[PDB]
Amino acid sequence: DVISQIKVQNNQISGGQLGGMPQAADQQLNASIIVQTRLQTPEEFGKILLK
Amino acid sequence: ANYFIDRPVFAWVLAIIMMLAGGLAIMNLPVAQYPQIAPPTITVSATYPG
Amino acid sequence: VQQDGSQVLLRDVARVELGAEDYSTVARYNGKPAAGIAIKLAAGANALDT
């Protein structure tokens, strides 16, 4: 359970782009989406939710 | 050296051999705009969709 | 498959279309859609006959 939770909560989820090819006409916004990033400090690791 | 003056046929034969070798070279010699000037570089490309 | 019995298909939830792999490039030749190829020659080859 600990290994699976670490794998789930220490991932590199690729959100994508808020408006990207093929985009709609008259589209005037383009930005990247950030969902998750890999943890960096033991304090963050110790806060992983097991249950 | 100077001994070709006594033997014109040897000089003419050498000239003919040179011309034939040059024609053979021109027949099969690679041509290009420029030779390999840039140092070799290797490119590694990876894609992570999204 | 629902309890009613009607079959749920992919076309019922999505649009399936023969599209492109990479959509992030618009290539136009004189304003018209186009695609190109670059030929990089070989070593020991004749650039004229090639």
Coordinates of C-alpha atoms in Angstrom, one line a residue:
Chain A
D1 CA 0.0 0.0 0.0
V2 CA 2.8 2.4 0.9
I3 CA 4.6 1.7 -2.4
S4 CA 1.4 2.1 -4.5
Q5 CA 0.6 5.4 -2.7
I6 CA 4.1 6.7 -3.3
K7 CA 3.8 5.8 -7.0
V8 CA 0.5 7.5 -7.3
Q9 CA 1.4 10.7 -5.4
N10 CA 5.0 11.1 -6.8
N11 CA 4.1 11.2 -10.5
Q12 CA 4.7 13.6 -13.4
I13 CA 1.2 14.0 -14.7
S14 CA 1.2 15.8 -18.0
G15 CA -1.8 18.1 -18.0
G16 CA -1.6 19.4 -21.6
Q17 CA -2.5 22.8 -23.0
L18 CA -5.5 25.0 -22.4
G19 CA -6.1 25.6 -26.1
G20 CA -3.9 23.6 -28.5
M21 CA -3.8 22.2 -32.0
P22 CA -6.3 21.5 -33.4
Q23 CA -7.7 24.6 -31.8
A24 CA -11.0 26.4 -32.6
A25 CA -11.1 29.5 -34.7
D26 CA -10.8 32.9 -33.1
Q27 CA -8.9 31.3 -30.3
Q28 CA -6.7 33.8 -28.5
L29 CA -5.5 31.9 -25.4
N30 CA -2.6 29.4 -25.1
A31 CA -1.1 28.2 -21.9
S32 CA 0.2 25.0 -20.3
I33 CA -1.6 23.0 -17.6
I34 CA 0.2 21.8 -14.5
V35 CA -1.4 19.0 -12.6
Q36 CA 1.2 17.2 -10.5
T37 CA 5.0 17.4 -10.0
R38 CA 7.5 15.1 -8.3
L39 CA 8.0 15.7 -4.6
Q40 CA 11.2 17.5 -3.5
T41 CA 11.6 17.3 0.3
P42 CA 11.0 14.7 3.0
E43 CA 8.4 17.0 4.6
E44 CA 6.3 16.6 1.4
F45 CA 6.9 12.8 1.3
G46 CA 5.7 12.4 4.9
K47 CA 2.4 14.0 4.0
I48 CA 1.4 11.4 1.4
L49 CA -2.1 10.2 2.2
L50 CA -2.3 6.5 2.8
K51 CA -5.9 6.2 3.9
Chain B
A1 CA 65.1 14.0 -65.5
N2 CA 66.9 15.0 -68.7
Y3 CA 66.8 11.6 -70.2
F4 CA 63.2 12.1 -71.5
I5 CA 64.6 14.4 -74.1
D6 CA 66.2 11.4 -75.8
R7 CA 62.9 9.4 -75.5
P8 CA 59.9 11.5 -76.6
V9 CA 57.7 8.4 -76.9
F10 CA 58.1 7.7 -73.2
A11 CA 57.0 11.3 -72.4
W12 CA 54.0 11.0 -74.7
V13 CA 53.0 7.7 -73.2
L14 CA 53.2 9.2 -69.7
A15 CA 51.0 12.1 -70.9
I16 CA 48.5 9.6 -72.4
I17 CA 48.4 7.6 -69.1
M18 CA 47.8 10.8 -67.2
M19 CA 45.0 11.8 -69.5
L20 CA 43.3 8.4 -69.3
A21 CA 43.6 8.3 -65.5
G22 CA 42.1 11.8 -65.3
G23 CA 39.2 10.8 -67.5
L24 CA 38.6 7.8 -65.3
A25 CA 38.7 9.9 -62.2
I26 CA 36.3 12.5 -63.7
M27 CA 34.0 9.6 -64.7
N28 CA 33.6 8.4 -61.1
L29 CA 34.4 11.2 -58.6
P30 CA 31.8 12.3 -56.0
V31 CA 30.6 15.9 -56.4
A32 CA 28.9 18.2 -53.9
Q33 CA 28.5 21.9 -53.1
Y34 CA 30.8 21.6 -50.0
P35 CA 32.5 18.7 -48.2
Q36 CA 32.0 17.6 -44.6
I37 CA 33.0 20.8 -42.8
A38 CA 31.0 20.7 -39.6
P39 CA 32.1 18.4 -36.8
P40 CA 29.9 15.3 -36.4
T41 CA 26.9 15.8 -34.1
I42 CA 24.4 13.3 -32.8
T43 CA 20.8 14.3 -32.0
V44 CA 18.6 12.4 -29.5
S45 CA 14.9 13.3 -29.8
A46 CA 12.2 12.2 -27.4
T47 CA 8.5 13.1 -27.3
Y48 CA 6.3 13.3 -24.2
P49 CA 2.7 14.0 -25.5
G50 CA 1.2 16.7 -23.3
Chain C
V1 CA -24.1 -2.8 -22.3
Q2 CA -26.9 -1.3 -20.3
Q3 CA -29.5 -3.1 -18.2
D4 CA -32.1 -2.1 -20.8
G5 CA -30.1 -3.9 -23.5
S6 CA -29.1 -1.1 -25.8
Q7 CA -25.4 -1.3 -26.8
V8 CA -23.1 1.6 -26.0
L9 CA -20.6 2.1 -28.8
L10 CA -17.6 4.4 -29.1
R11 CA -19.4 6.6 -31.6
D12 CA -22.0 7.2 -29.0
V13 CA -19.5 9.0 -26.7
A14 CA -16.8 10.2 -29.2
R15 CA -16.1 11.4 -32.7
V16 CA -13.8 9.0 -34.6
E17 CA -11.8 10.6 -37.5
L18 CA -8.7 9.9 -39.6
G19 CA -6.7 12.9 -38.4
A20 CA -3.0 13.7 -37.9
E21 CA -0.4 12.5 -35.4
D22 CA 1.1 16.0 -34.8
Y23 CA -1.3 18.9 -35.2
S24 CA 1.2 21.6 -34.2
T25 CA 2.5 22.7 -37.6
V26 CA 0.8 24.6 -40.5
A27 CA 2.7 24.1 -43.8
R28 CA 1.7 26.3 -46.7
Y29 CA 3.2 26.7 -50.2
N30 CA 2.1 30.0 -51.8
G31 CA -0.8 30.0 -49.4
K32 CA -1.9 26.4 -50.2
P33 CA -1.5 23.3 -48.0
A34 CA 1.7 21.3 -48.8
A35 CA 4.2 18.8 -47.4
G36 CA 7.8 18.5 -48.4
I37 CA 10.8 16.2 -48.3
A38 CA 14.5 16.9 -47.9
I39 CA 17.0 14.6 -49.6
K40 CA 20.4 14.5 -47.9
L41 CA 22.5 12.6 -50.4
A42 CA 25.1 10.0 -49.5
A43 CA 28.9 9.5 -49.3
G44 CA 30.7 8.8 -52.5
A45 CA 27.7 9.8 -54.6
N46 CA 27.4 12.1 -57.5
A47 CA 25.2 15.1 -56.7
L48 CA 24.3 15.6 -60.4
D49 CA 23.2 12.1 -61.3
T50 CA 21.5 11.7 -58.0

